Design a protein around this nucleic acid. Structure first.
Lengths: 68, 64
DNA sequence: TATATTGCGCAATATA
DNA sequence: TATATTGCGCAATATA
C-alpha cells in the first residue's frame, strides 16, 4: 500500500514489536534467575538427602547387630 | 539494481543470521527446560526427604 | 477493528 | 577476505 493508513499501521506495529521483544527478553532473564534459585534449592535438598541417608544407614546397621 | 558481489554477500549473511539466531533460540529453550528439570528433581528430592524421615521414625519406634 | 508474536532481511557491528 | 552477532523494521500469523 505505502499510503497514510499503511504508515500509521506500520508505526503501531513497530511499537508493538519492540514491546513484544522486550517482554520476551525480560522473560528470558527471569528464567535464568529461576535456574539459580532452583539450583541452590537443589543443592540444599541433595545435602539433606545425603544426611538422612547416612543417618538411616547407621541406625539400620545398629539394629541388625541385635541378637535374636 | 545491485551488483553480483552484493547479492552473494547478502545471500551468505542471511544464512549466517538465521544460523546464529537458531542457536540463540535453542540456548533460550535449554534454559527453559532446565527450569522444568530442576523443578521435577527438587520435587523428587523433597519426597525422598519425607520418605527417609518416615523410615527413620518407624525404625526408631522399634526401641519401645 | 485492534495489538501481540516472531521468522526473516537488512546493515551496522563484532570477530576470525 | 570471511562468518558471527544483533538492534530496527517488515510482514505473515496469532490473538483479542
Amino acid at each position: 500500500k505505502h499510503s497514510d493508513e499503511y504508515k500509521i499501521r506500520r508505526e503501531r506495529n513497530n511499537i508493538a514489536a519492540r514491546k513484544s521483544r522486550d517482554k520476551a527478553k525480560m522473560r528470558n532473564l527471569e528464567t535464568q534467575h529461576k535456574v539459580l534459585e532452583l539450583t541452590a534449592e537443589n543443592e540444599r535438598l541433595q545435602k539433606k538427602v545425603e544426611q538422612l541417608s547416612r543417618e538411616l544407614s547407621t541406625l539400620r546397621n545398629l539394629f541388625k547387630q541385635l541378637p535374636e
